[PDB]
Amino acid sequence: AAQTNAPWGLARISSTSPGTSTYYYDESAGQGSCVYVIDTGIEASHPEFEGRAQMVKTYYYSSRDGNGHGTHCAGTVGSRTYGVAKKTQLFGVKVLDDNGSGQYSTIIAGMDFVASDKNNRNCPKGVVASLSLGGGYSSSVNSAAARLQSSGVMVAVAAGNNNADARNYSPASEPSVCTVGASDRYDRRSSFSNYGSVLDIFGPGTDILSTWIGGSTRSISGTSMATPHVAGLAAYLMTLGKTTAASACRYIADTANKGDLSNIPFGTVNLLAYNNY
């Protein structure tokens, strides 16, 4: 399949070179996979989700995404126009408030919730979790993300937007999950992206168009935008049978575009997510 006039990040995932505008992908499109978007919620009524999105848990009075961040991330995973895996099932877990903040205890509880809830769901091609969030180093947050991965979920997390080593942030610093840095449309490391040995992969993160609340769309920038590209790519590849939840991060790194990014510090991988379609 080919989506013309795609967002640059989708085009980038399916090309060896920057600057293209068509996203080429297998028609299976993540059908039969599920991706939990652990964030500010999802405006599940948005037409771009085509009924494939639903909220399953909140940690606040409401399940509404009063911010937009979670809806944006979910759209990069799985919306018709802005998504990597256009047929995946999306589940929303609201661990962040409408200002985009959350307590570490709530973020931990949300990960443990997903690890159990997936057993209530039909996800024959497997389960992914996208965590476009983080804060300072916490062993308890890292351990929660490790448990979620161990339980059989492909966990993708944002490296952070501190232009610093991700070793000092969580869950970015957890070794066993997939830690995602951000790039821009000219194949530069995004100016804000964290870096470091713990990164596993880069995805598009500067000026990413996706869904927004009020049935709208908008472009924003962050490692929060890179992460759902990788989460959706994992769901896509799992649906194709090319990899598993346990091995998808490694497989994505194995099959990535290598050596294309500029301003990558020594000791950080130079690997950009790629579907090899």
PDB file of C-alpha atoms in Angstrom:
ATOM      1  CA  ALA A   1       0.000   0.000   0.000  1.00  0.00           C
ATOM      2  CA  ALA A   2       1.089   3.635  -0.515  1.00  0.00           C
ATOM      3  CA  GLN A   3      -0.099   6.755   1.256  1.00  0.00           C
ATOM      4  CA  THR A   4       0.761   9.826  -0.817  1.00  0.00           C
ATOM      5  CA  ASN A   5       1.332  13.212   0.794  1.00  0.00           C
ATOM      6  CA  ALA A   6       2.008  11.486   4.061  1.00  0.00           C
ATOM      7  CA  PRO A   7       3.489  13.180   7.107  1.00  0.00           C
ATOM      8  CA  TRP A   8       7.242  13.286   6.648  1.00  0.00           C
ATOM      9  CA  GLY A   9       7.844  10.860   9.495  1.00  0.00           C
ATOM     10  CA  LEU A  10       5.722   8.147   7.967  1.00  0.00           C
ATOM     11  CA  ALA A  11       7.478   8.602   4.638  1.00  0.00           C
ATOM     12  CA  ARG A  12      10.797   8.496   6.480  1.00  0.00           C
ATOM     13  CA  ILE A  13       9.984   5.080   8.075  1.00  0.00           C
ATOM     14  CA  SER A  14       9.602   3.525   4.629  1.00  0.00           C
ATOM     15  CA  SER A  15      12.580   5.107   2.790  1.00  0.00           C
ATOM     16  CA  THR A  16      16.343   4.784   2.985  1.00  0.00           C
ATOM     17  CA  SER A  17      16.622   8.543   2.324  1.00  0.00           C
ATOM     18  CA  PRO A  18      15.088  11.722   3.781  1.00  0.00           C
ATOM     19  CA  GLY A  19      12.903  14.097   1.782  1.00  0.00           C
ATOM     20  CA  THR A  20      10.238  11.773   0.384  1.00  0.00           C
ATOM     21  CA  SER A  21       6.479  12.137   0.946  1.00  0.00           C
ATOM     22  CA  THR A  22       4.964   8.675   0.256  1.00  0.00           C
ATOM     23  CA  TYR A  23       4.548   6.113   3.053  1.00  0.00           C
ATOM     24  CA  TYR A  24       4.819   2.580   1.640  1.00  0.00           C
ATOM     25  CA  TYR A  25       3.573  -0.237   3.903  1.00  0.00           C
ATOM     26  CA  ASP A  26       2.015  -3.713   3.830  1.00  0.00           C
ATOM     27  CA  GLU A  27      -1.803  -3.636   3.772  1.00  0.00           C
ATOM     28  CA  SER A  28      -2.014  -5.740   6.969  1.00  0.00           C
ATOM     29  CA  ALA A  29      -1.273  -2.433   8.724  1.00  0.00           C
ATOM     30  CA  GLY A  30      -1.019  -3.939  12.262  1.00  0.00           C
ATOM     31  CA  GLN A  31      -4.383  -5.638  12.084  1.00  0.00           C
ATOM     32  CA  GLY A  32      -4.731  -8.005  15.063  1.00  0.00           C
ATOM     33  CA  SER A  33      -2.200  -6.175  17.214  1.00  0.00           C
ATOM     34  CA  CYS A  34      -2.973  -3.867  20.121  1.00  0.00           C
ATOM     35  CA  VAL A  35      -1.098  -0.767  21.353  1.00  0.00           C
ATOM     36  CA  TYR A  36      -1.700   0.755  24.791  1.00  0.00           C
ATOM     37  CA  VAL A  37      -1.035   4.497  24.724  1.00  0.00           C
ATOM     38  CA  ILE A  38      -0.118   5.362  28.322  1.00  0.00           C
ATOM     39  CA  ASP A  39      -0.519   9.122  28.406  1.00  0.00           C
ATOM     40  CA  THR A  40      -3.062  11.943  28.930  1.00  0.00           C
ATOM     41  CA  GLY A  41      -5.858   9.807  27.386  1.00  0.00           C
ATOM     42  CA  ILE A  42      -7.231   9.540  23.861  1.00  0.00           C
ATOM     43  CA  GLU A  43     -10.147  11.386  22.242  1.00  0.00           C
ATOM     44  CA  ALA A  44     -11.479   8.071  21.134  1.00  0.00           C
ATOM     45  CA  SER A  45     -14.323   9.755  19.273  1.00  0.00           C
ATOM     46  CA  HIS A  46     -11.935  11.338  16.688  1.00  0.00           C
ATOM     47  CA  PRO A  47     -12.877  10.269  13.132  1.00  0.00           C
ATOM     48  CA  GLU A  48      -9.226   9.464  12.406  1.00  0.00           C
ATOM     49  CA  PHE A  49      -9.393   6.465  14.780  1.00  0.00           C
ATOM     50  CA  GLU A  50     -12.290   4.929  12.813  1.00  0.00           C
ATOM     51  CA  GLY A  51     -13.672   3.321  15.971  1.00  0.00           C
ATOM     52  CA  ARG A  52     -10.382   1.439  16.656  1.00  0.00           C
ATOM     53  CA  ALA A  53      -9.641   3.398  19.841  1.00  0.00           C
ATOM     54  CA  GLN A  54     -11.067   3.137  23.337  1.00  0.00           C
ATOM     55  CA  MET A  55     -10.193   4.270  26.820  1.00  0.00           C
ATOM     56  CA  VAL A  56      -9.697   1.427  29.295  1.00  0.00           C
ATOM     57  CA  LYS A  57      -8.407   3.108  32.460  1.00  0.00           C
ATOM     58  CA  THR A  58      -7.928   6.496  34.060  1.00  0.00           C
ATOM     59  CA  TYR A  59      -6.188   7.679  37.220  1.00  0.00           C
ATOM     60  CA  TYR A  60      -8.101  10.959  37.359  1.00  0.00           C
ATOM     61  CA  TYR A  61     -11.703  11.967  37.725  1.00  0.00           C
ATOM     62  CA  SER A  62     -12.176  11.875  33.984  1.00  0.00           C
ATOM     63  CA  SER A  63     -10.919   9.738  31.105  1.00  0.00           C
ATOM     64  CA  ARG A  64     -11.029  12.678  28.705  1.00  0.00           C
ATOM     65  CA  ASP A  65      -7.835  13.879  27.084  1.00  0.00           C
ATOM     66  CA  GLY A  66      -8.012  17.496  28.102  1.00  0.00           C
ATOM     67  CA  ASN A  67      -4.495  18.158  26.825  1.00  0.00           C
ATOM     68  CA  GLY A  68      -4.071  16.641  23.351  1.00  0.00           C
ATOM     69  CA  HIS A  69      -0.718  14.955  23.900  1.00  0.00           C
ATOM     70  CA  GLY A  70      -2.107  11.446  24.262  1.00  0.00           C
ATOM     71  CA  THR A  71      -4.438  11.870  21.280  1.00  0.00           C
ATOM     72  CA  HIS A  72      -1.448  13.056  19.219  1.00  0.00           C
ATOM     73  CA  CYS A  73       0.676  10.072  20.228  1.00  0.00           C
ATOM     74  CA  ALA A  74      -2.147   7.628  19.609  1.00  0.00           C
ATOM     75  CA  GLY A  75      -2.642   9.152  16.150  1.00  0.00           C
ATOM     76  CA  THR A  76       0.994   8.517  15.266  1.00  0.00           C
ATOM     77  CA  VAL A  77       0.619   4.877  16.327  1.00  0.00           C
ATOM     78  CA  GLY A  78      -2.616   4.152  14.588  1.00  0.00           C
ATOM     79  CA  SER A  79      -4.723   6.881  12.946  1.00  0.00           C
ATOM     80  CA  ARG A  80      -5.798   6.498   9.322  1.00  0.00           C
ATOM     81  CA  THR A  81      -3.864   9.529   8.029  1.00  0.00           C
ATOM     82  CA  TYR A  82      -1.139  10.078  10.638  1.00  0.00           C
ATOM     83  CA  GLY A  83      -0.468   6.531  11.882  1.00  0.00           C
ATOM     84  CA  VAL A  84       2.188   3.914  11.280  1.00  0.00           C
ATOM     85  CA  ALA A  85      -0.121   0.892  11.917  1.00  0.00           C
ATOM     86  CA  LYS A  86      -3.430   2.015  10.447  1.00  0.00           C
ATOM     87  CA  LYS A  87      -5.431  -1.078  11.504  1.00  0.00           C
ATOM     88  CA  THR A  88      -4.122  -1.623  15.039  1.00  0.00           C
ATOM     89  CA  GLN A  89      -6.394  -1.496  18.105  1.00  0.00           C
ATOM     90  CA  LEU A  90      -5.621   1.394  20.428  1.00  0.00           C
ATOM     91  CA  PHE A  91      -6.204   1.339  24.185  1.00  0.00           C
ATOM     92  CA  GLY A  92      -5.935   4.493  26.259  1.00  0.00           C
ATOM     93  CA  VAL A  93      -4.581   4.575  29.820  1.00  0.00           C
ATOM     94  CA  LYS A  94      -4.706   8.050  31.382  1.00  0.00           C
ATOM     95  CA  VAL A  95      -1.770   8.289  33.798  1.00  0.00           C
ATOM     96  CA  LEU A  96      -1.082  11.935  32.980  1.00  0.00           C
ATOM     97  CA  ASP A  97      -3.303  14.843  33.927  1.00  0.00           C
ATOM     98  CA  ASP A  98      -4.479  17.534  31.545  1.00  0.00           C
ATOM     99  CA  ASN A  99      -1.307  19.525  32.178  1.00  0.00           C
ATOM    100  CA  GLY A 100       0.716  16.519  31.034  1.00  0.00           C
ATOM    101  CA  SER A 101       1.998  15.603  34.501  1.00  0.00           C
ATOM    102  CA  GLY A 102       1.689  12.504  36.622  1.00  0.00           C
ATOM    103  CA  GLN A 103       3.056  11.061  39.816  1.00  0.00           C
ATOM    104  CA  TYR A 104       5.497   8.200  39.487  1.00  0.00           C
ATOM    105  CA  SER A 105       3.212   6.051  41.650  1.00  0.00           C
ATOM    106  CA  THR A 106       0.422   6.535  39.081  1.00  0.00           C
ATOM    107  CA  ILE A 107       2.681   5.798  36.109  1.00  0.00           C
ATOM    108  CA  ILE A 108       3.803   2.570  37.843  1.00  0.00           C
ATOM    109  CA  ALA A 109       0.203   1.548  38.568  1.00  0.00           C
ATOM    110  CA  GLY A 110      -0.696   2.204  34.925  1.00  0.00           C
ATOM    111  CA  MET A 111       2.050  -0.076  33.652  1.00  0.00           C
ATOM    112  CA  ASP A 112       1.013  -2.863  36.012  1.00  0.00           C
ATOM    113  CA  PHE A 113      -2.577  -2.349  34.875  1.00  0.00           C
ATOM    114  CA  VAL A 114      -1.610  -2.917  31.258  1.00  0.00           C
ATOM    115  CA  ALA A 115       0.350  -6.052  32.102  1.00  0.00           C
ATOM    116  CA  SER A 116      -2.846  -7.561  33.518  1.00  0.00           C
ATOM    117  CA  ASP A 117      -5.484  -5.950  31.299  1.00  0.00           C
ATOM    118  CA  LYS A 118      -3.988  -7.374  28.129  1.00  0.00           C
ATOM    119  CA  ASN A 119      -5.382 -10.714  29.319  1.00  0.00           C
ATOM    120  CA  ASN A 120      -8.905  -9.280  28.883  1.00  0.00           C
ATOM    121  CA  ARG A 121      -8.252  -8.329  25.259  1.00  0.00           C
ATOM    122  CA  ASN A 122      -8.081 -10.003  21.881  1.00  0.00           C
ATOM    123  CA  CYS A 123      -4.684  -9.171  20.454  1.00  0.00           C
ATOM    124  CA  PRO A 124      -3.698 -12.269  18.483  1.00  0.00           C
ATOM    125  CA  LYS A 125      -0.692 -10.606  16.844  1.00  0.00           C
ATOM    126  CA  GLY A 126       0.603  -9.257  20.178  1.00  0.00           C
ATOM    127  CA  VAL A 127       0.692  -6.251  22.462  1.00  0.00           C
ATOM    128  CA  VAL A 128       2.735  -3.031  22.499  1.00  0.00           C
ATOM    129  CA  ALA A 129       2.843  -0.187  25.018  1.00  0.00           C
ATOM    130  CA  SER A 130       3.860   3.380  24.080  1.00  0.00           C
ATOM    131  CA  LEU A 131       5.126   5.578  26.937  1.00  0.00           C
ATOM    132  CA  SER A 132       5.755   9.141  25.780  1.00  0.00           C
ATOM    133  CA  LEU A 133       6.578  10.287  29.281  1.00  0.00           C
ATOM    134  CA  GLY A 134       9.328  10.333  31.846  1.00  0.00           C
ATOM    135  CA  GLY A 135      11.123  12.239  34.532  1.00  0.00           C
ATOM    136  CA  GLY A 136      14.225  11.852  36.697  1.00  0.00           C
ATOM    137  CA  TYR A 137      15.885   8.520  37.388  1.00  0.00           C
ATOM    138  CA  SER A 138      13.729   6.188  39.480  1.00  0.00           C
ATOM    139  CA  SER A 139      14.537   2.552  40.034  1.00  0.00           C
ATOM    140  CA  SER A 140      10.880   1.826  40.806  1.00  0.00           C
ATOM    141  CA  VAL A 141       9.710   3.364  37.536  1.00  0.00           C
ATOM    142  CA  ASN A 142      12.355   1.416  35.633  1.00  0.00           C
ATOM    143  CA  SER A 143      11.354  -1.790  37.354  1.00  0.00           C
ATOM    144  CA  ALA A 144       7.692  -1.243  36.417  1.00  0.00           C
ATOM    145  CA  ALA A 145       8.645  -0.871  32.775  1.00  0.00           C
ATOM    146  CA  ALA A 146      10.830  -3.980  32.988  1.00  0.00           C
ATOM    147  CA  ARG A 147       7.888  -5.945  34.450  1.00  0.00           C
ATOM    148  CA  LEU A 148       5.582  -4.763  31.672  1.00  0.00           C
ATOM    149  CA  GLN A 149       8.106  -5.940  29.064  1.00  0.00           C
ATOM    150  CA  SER A 150       8.673  -9.230  30.903  1.00  0.00           C
ATOM    151  CA  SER A 151       4.907  -9.847  30.950  1.00  0.00           C
ATOM    152  CA  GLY A 152       4.970 -10.032  27.168  1.00  0.00           C
ATOM    153  CA  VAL A 153       4.394  -6.443  25.992  1.00  0.00           C
ATOM    154  CA  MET A 154       6.696  -4.635  23.574  1.00  0.00           C
ATOM    155  CA  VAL A 155       7.461  -1.487  25.625  1.00  0.00           C
ATOM    156  CA  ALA A 156       8.639   1.647  23.780  1.00  0.00           C
ATOM    157  CA  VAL A 157       9.588   4.738  25.842  1.00  0.00           C
ATOM    158  CA  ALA A 158      10.710   8.274  25.093  1.00  0.00           C
ATOM    159  CA  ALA A 159      14.367   9.116  25.621  1.00  0.00           C
ATOM    160  CA  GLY A 160      13.450  12.578  26.931  1.00  0.00           C
ATOM    161  CA  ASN A 161      13.805  16.165  25.668  1.00  0.00           C
ATOM    162  CA  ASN A 162      16.688  17.399  27.801  1.00  0.00           C
ATOM    163  CA  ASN A 163      19.493  17.323  25.189  1.00  0.00           C
ATOM    164  CA  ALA A 164      21.324  15.155  27.734  1.00  0.00           C
ATOM    165  CA  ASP A 165      22.296  11.574  28.548  1.00  0.00           C
ATOM    166  CA  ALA A 166      19.146   9.497  29.067  1.00  0.00           C
ATOM    167  CA  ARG A 167      20.891   7.474  31.821  1.00  0.00           C
ATOM    168  CA  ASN A 168      19.490  10.062  34.267  1.00  0.00           C
ATOM    169  CA  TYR A 169      15.833   9.708  33.271  1.00  0.00           C
ATOM    170  CA  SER A 170      13.149   7.072  33.686  1.00  0.00           C
ATOM    171  CA  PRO A 171      11.782   4.953  32.197  1.00  0.00           C
ATOM    172  CA  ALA A 172      14.266   5.915  29.449  1.00  0.00           C
ATOM    173  CA  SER A 173      17.189   4.422  31.375  1.00  0.00           C
ATOM    174  CA  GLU A 174      15.601   0.945  31.834  1.00  0.00           C
ATOM    175  CA  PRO A 175      17.778  -1.382  29.683  1.00  0.00           C
ATOM    176  CA  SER A 176      15.124  -3.974  28.858  1.00  0.00           C
ATOM    177  CA  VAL A 177      12.642  -1.666  27.127  1.00  0.00           C
ATOM    178  CA  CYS A 178      13.002   0.191  23.794  1.00  0.00           C
ATOM    179  CA  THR A 179      14.307   3.734  24.400  1.00  0.00           C
ATOM    180  CA  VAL A 180      13.533   6.083  21.488  1.00  0.00           C
ATOM    181  CA  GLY A 181      15.354   9.258  20.465  1.00  0.00           C
ATOM    182  CA  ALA A 182      14.079  11.898  18.031  1.00  0.00           C
ATOM    183  CA  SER A 183      15.216  13.014  14.589  1.00  0.00           C
ATOM    184  CA  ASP A 184      14.181  15.790  12.222  1.00  0.00           C
ATOM    185  CA  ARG A 185      13.213  15.770   8.565  1.00  0.00           C
ATOM    186  CA  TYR A 186      16.822  16.460   7.470  1.00  0.00           C
ATOM    187  CA  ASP A 187      18.157  13.454   9.402  1.00  0.00           C
ATOM    188  CA  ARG A 188      19.641  15.523  12.236  1.00  0.00           C
ATOM    189  CA  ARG A 189      19.268  14.427  15.821  1.00  0.00           C
ATOM    190  CA  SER A 190      16.457  16.626  17.079  1.00  0.00           C
ATOM    191  CA  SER A 191      17.925  19.550  18.991  1.00  0.00           C
ATOM    192  CA  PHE A 192      16.176  18.569  22.224  1.00  0.00           C
ATOM    193  CA  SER A 193      16.616  14.805  21.977  1.00  0.00           C
ATOM    194  CA  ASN A 194      18.398  12.927  24.731  1.00  0.00           C
ATOM    195  CA  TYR A 195      21.196  10.595  23.701  1.00  0.00           C
ATOM    196  CA  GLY A 196      23.433   8.030  25.361  1.00  0.00           C
ATOM    197  CA  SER A 197      24.267   4.362  25.373  1.00  0.00           C
ATOM    198  CA  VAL A 198      20.774   3.410  26.603  1.00  0.00           C
ATOM    199  CA  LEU A 199      19.076   4.598  23.426  1.00  0.00           C
ATOM    200  CA  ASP A 200      18.058   1.756  21.180  1.00  0.00           C
ATOM    201  CA  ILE A 201      16.680   3.587  18.154  1.00  0.00           C
ATOM    202  CA  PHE A 202      15.666   6.937  16.687  1.00  0.00           C
ATOM    203  CA  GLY A 203      12.378   7.860  15.144  1.00  0.00           C
ATOM    204  CA  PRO A 204      10.893  11.020  13.612  1.00  0.00           C
ATOM    205  CA  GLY A 205      10.170  13.570  16.341  1.00  0.00           C
ATOM    206  CA  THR A 206      10.524  17.177  15.036  1.00  0.00           C
ATOM    207  CA  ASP A 207       7.382  18.748  13.474  1.00  0.00           C
ATOM    208  CA  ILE A 208       5.131  15.666  13.542  1.00  0.00           C
ATOM    209  CA  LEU A 209       1.567  16.124  12.304  1.00  0.00           C
ATOM    210  CA  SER A 210      -1.039  13.985  14.043  1.00  0.00           C
ATOM    211  CA  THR A 211      -4.484  14.040  15.594  1.00  0.00           C
ATOM    212  CA  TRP A 212      -5.454  16.533  18.329  1.00  0.00           C
ATOM    213  CA  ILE A 213      -8.465  17.044  20.584  1.00  0.00           C
ATOM    214  CA  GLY A 214     -11.618  18.688  19.346  1.00  0.00           C
ATOM    215  CA  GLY A 215     -11.445  16.551  16.227  1.00  0.00           C
ATOM    216  CA  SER A 216      -8.455  18.551  15.019  1.00  0.00           C
ATOM    217  CA  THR A 217      -4.834  18.008  13.941  1.00  0.00           C
ATOM    218  CA  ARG A 218      -1.580  19.687  14.785  1.00  0.00           C
ATOM    219  CA  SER A 219       2.180  19.398  14.468  1.00  0.00           C
ATOM    220  CA  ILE A 220       4.334  19.223  17.616  1.00  0.00           C
ATOM    221  CA  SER A 221       7.865  18.111  18.458  1.00  0.00           C
ATOM    222  CA  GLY A 222       9.428  15.789  21.008  1.00  0.00           C
ATOM    223  CA  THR A 223      10.769  12.365  21.799  1.00  0.00           C
ATOM    224  CA  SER A 224       7.089  11.840  22.689  1.00  0.00           C
ATOM    225  CA  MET A 225       6.406  11.942  18.927  1.00  0.00           C
ATOM    226  CA  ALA A 226       9.259   9.587  18.014  1.00  0.00           C
ATOM    227  CA  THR A 227       8.149   6.877  20.474  1.00  0.00           C
ATOM    228  CA  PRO A 228       4.777   6.103  18.845  1.00  0.00           C
ATOM    229  CA  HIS A 229       6.449   5.742  15.456  1.00  0.00           C
ATOM    230  CA  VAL A 230       8.478   2.904  16.953  1.00  0.00           C
ATOM    231  CA  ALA A 231       5.510   1.468  18.881  1.00  0.00           C
ATOM    232  CA  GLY A 232       3.441   1.448  15.726  1.00  0.00           C
ATOM    233  CA  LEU A 233       6.297  -0.045  13.699  1.00  0.00           C
ATOM    234  CA  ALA A 234       6.615  -2.852  16.242  1.00  0.00           C
ATOM    235  CA  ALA A 235       2.873  -3.547  15.994  1.00  0.00           C
ATOM    236  CA  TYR A 236       3.121  -3.567  12.209  1.00  0.00           C
ATOM    237  CA  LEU A 237       6.069  -5.985  12.210  1.00  0.00           C
ATOM    238  CA  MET A 238       4.448  -8.261  14.828  1.00  0.00           C
ATOM    239  CA  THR A 239       1.328  -8.448  12.669  1.00  0.00           C
ATOM    240  CA  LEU A 240       3.563  -9.476   9.758  1.00  0.00           C
ATOM    241  CA  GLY A 241       5.130 -12.213  11.859  1.00  0.00           C
ATOM    242  CA  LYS A 242       8.604 -10.794  11.416  1.00  0.00           C
ATOM    243  CA  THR A 243       9.297 -10.365  15.104  1.00  0.00           C
ATOM    244  CA  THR A 244       7.874 -10.832  18.593  1.00  0.00           C
ATOM    245  CA  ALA A 245       7.142  -8.597  21.552  1.00  0.00           C
ATOM    246  CA  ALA A 246      10.281  -9.825  23.258  1.00  0.00           C
ATOM    247  CA  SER A 247      12.555  -9.217  20.288  1.00  0.00           C
ATOM    248  CA  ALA A 248      10.959  -6.346  18.369  1.00  0.00           C
ATOM    249  CA  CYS A 249      13.287  -3.617  19.671  1.00  0.00           C
ATOM    250  CA  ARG A 250      16.365  -5.611  18.704  1.00  0.00           C
ATOM    251  CA  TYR A 251      14.798  -6.476  15.349  1.00  0.00           C
ATOM    252  CA  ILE A 252      14.007  -2.811  14.670  1.00  0.00           C
ATOM    253  CA  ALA A 253      17.608  -1.932  15.517  1.00  0.00           C
ATOM    254  CA  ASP A 254      18.894  -4.828  13.335  1.00  0.00           C
ATOM    255  CA  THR A 255      16.843  -3.606  10.342  1.00  0.00           C
ATOM    256  CA  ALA A 256      17.172   0.150  10.844  1.00  0.00           C
ATOM    257  CA  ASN A 257      18.721   2.696   8.540  1.00  0.00           C
ATOM    258  CA  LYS A 258      22.238   2.931   9.884  1.00  0.00           C
ATOM    259  CA  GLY A 259      24.568   5.912   9.756  1.00  0.00           C
ATOM    260  CA  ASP A 260      22.101   8.424   8.363  1.00  0.00           C
ATOM    261  CA  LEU A 261      21.743  10.842  11.290  1.00  0.00           C
ATOM    262  CA  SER A 262      23.951  13.824  12.067  1.00  0.00           C
ATOM    263  CA  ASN A 263      24.953  15.261  15.455  1.00  0.00           C
ATOM    264  CA  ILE A 264      24.847  11.830  17.102  1.00  0.00           C
ATOM    265  CA  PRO A 265      27.323  11.908  20.049  1.00  0.00           C
ATOM    266  CA  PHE A 266      29.993   9.220  20.309  1.00  0.00           C
ATOM    267  CA  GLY A 267      28.518   6.239  22.137  1.00  0.00           C
ATOM    268  CA  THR A 268      24.931   6.684  20.898  1.00  0.00           C
ATOM    269  CA  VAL A 269      23.516   4.415  18.199  1.00  0.00           C
ATOM    270  CA  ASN A 270      23.027   5.943  14.709  1.00  0.00           C
ATOM    271  CA  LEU A 271      19.921   3.908  13.834  1.00  0.00           C
ATOM    272  CA  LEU A 272      16.667   5.167  12.390  1.00  0.00           C
ATOM    273  CA  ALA A 273      13.509   3.086  12.428  1.00  0.00           C
ATOM    274  CA  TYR A 274      12.755   1.555   9.017  1.00  0.00           C
ATOM    275  CA  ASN A 275      10.080  -0.895   7.819  1.00  0.00           C
ATOM    276  CA  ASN A 276      12.133  -2.326   4.907  1.00  0.00           C
ATOM    277  CA  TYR A 277       8.958  -2.617   2.884  1.00  0.00           C
TER     278      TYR A 277
END
